[PDB]
């Protein structure tokens, strides 16, 4: 249920292309092909950036016609 995401380095945005860029530290061991909980980490990290992206998008000039 939390809609906010805290990160050491702030995520940068290119909303004209619906894109977000995350420069935060990635761990090799968390993402290695032998790590079983690999895809859980990929999705979880992606979910955070998508959340931040959607937040930024919904703060743009907006109207529910």
């Amino acid at each position: 249920l939390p809609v906010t995401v805290e990160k050491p380095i702030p995520v940068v945005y290119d909303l004209g292309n619906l894109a977000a860029f995350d420069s935060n530290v990635l761990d090799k061991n968390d993402l290695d092909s032998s790590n079983a909980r690999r895809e859980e980490k990929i999705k979880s990290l992606t979910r955070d950036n998508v959340q931040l992206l959607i937040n930024q998008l919904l703060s743009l000039p907006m109207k529910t016609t």
């Binding site: 380095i9 940068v12 292309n17 619906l18 894109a19 977000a20 860029f21 995350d22 420069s23 935060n24 530290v25 990635l26 990290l45 992606t46 950036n49 998508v50 992206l53």
Partner: peptide, 12 residues
């Protein structure tokens, strides 16, 4: 239109 997220400082 798809959304994009890029993870990794090297992308920049």
């Amino acid at each position: 239109k798809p959304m994009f997220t890029f993870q990794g400082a090297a992308f920049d």
